[PDB]
């Protein structure tokens, strides 16, 4: 439940950071590729923050 966002600050700015920067993305996604826009944003950092930290000993 609760609100629909965590804080317009990140749901209004980072979510609208220069529409051009957000639109430049619509040039590589066909809707069905707008949802994974968040899943492909982490899998990258998650594998680049843990592997770069201690690269599994």
UniProtKB/Swiss-Prot annotation:
Query: What modifications follow translation?
Result: O-glycosylated. Ubiquitinated, leading to its degradation by the proteasome. Ubiquitination is reduced by CHP1.
Question: Tissue-wise, where is it found?
Answer: Kidney and intestine.
Membrane-traversing stretches: 6-29, 33-54
Record's subcellular location? Cell membrane; Basolateral cell membrane
What spans does the record annotate as topological domain Cytoplasmic, numbered to this chain? 30-32
Q: What does the function comment of this entry state?
A: Electroneutral Na(+) /H(+) antiporter that extrudes Na(+) in exchange for external protons driven by the inward sodium ion chemical gradient, protecting cells from acidification that occurs from metabolism. Exchanges intracellular H(+) ions for extracellular Na(+) in 1:1 stoichiometry. Plays a key role in maintening intracellular pH neutral and cell volume, and thus is important for cell growth, proliferation, migration and survival. In addition, can transport lithium Li(+) and also functions as a Na(+)/Li(+) antiporter.
As annotated, the protein's associated disorder is: Lichtenstein-Knorr syndrome: An autosomal recessive neurologic disorder characterized by progressive cerebellar ataxia and severe progressive sensorineural hearing loss.
- Assembly description: Homodimer; dimerization is crucial for its function. Oligomer. Interacts with CALM1 in a calcium-dependent manner. Interacts with TESC. Interacts (via the C-terminal domain) with CHP1; the interaction occurs at the plasma membrane in a calcium-dependent manner and facilitates the maturation, cell surface expression, and function of SLC9A3. Interacts with CHP2; the interaction occurs in a calcium-dependent manner. Interacts with EZR; regulates the cytoskeletal interactions of SLC9A1 and promotes stress fiber formation.
Quoted from the entry, the domain comment is: The C-terminal intracellular domain is subject to extensive post-translational modifications and binding partner interactions which regulate transporter activity, scaffolding functions, downstream events and localization.
Any remaining note in the record? Predicted models used for more than 20 years predicted 10-12 transmembrane segments. More recently, the structure of SLC9A1 has been solved and reveals that SLC9A1 possesses 13 transmembrane regions.
Q: Which family does it belong to?
A: Belongs to the monovalent cation:proton antiporter 1 (CPA1) transporter (TC 2.A.36) family.
What's the protein here called? Sodium/hydrogen exchanger 1
Supply the source organism for this entry.
Answer: Homo sapiens
Q: What gene makes this protein?
A: SLC9A1
